[PDB]
């Protein structure tokens, strides 16, 4: 759907929080420390 700037891609999979498109969602979760992540 275009390329995403500001959120990193993780290999984990959760439920869809913020839908982006083409099976990719975004969420605001912990990392350690808080940042926006992107996932399938």
């Amino acid at each position: 759907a275009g390329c995403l700037i500001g959120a990193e891609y993780v290999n984990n999979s959760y439920e869809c929080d913020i839908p982006i498109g083409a099976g990719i969602c975004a969420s605001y979760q912990t990392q350690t420390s808080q940042s926006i992540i992107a996932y399938t």
Partner: protein
């Protein structure tokens, strides 16, 4: 072996990378679809055919 019933043409096969069944491939081939999403991606119209 589901009691003699085949179920080979509706269950998915591992050979195809899309993991779609035999009937589903025929259903997808019978519909000629345009504008499936973002295919042009702001660069293909610069390649003026």
């Amino acid at each position: 072996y589901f009691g003699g019933f085949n179920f080979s043409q509706i269950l998915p096969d591992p050979s195809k990378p899309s993991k779609r069944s035999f009937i589903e491939d025929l259903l997808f081939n019978k519909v000629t679809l345009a504008d499936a999403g973002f295919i042009k991606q702001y660069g293909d119209c610069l390649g003026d055919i």
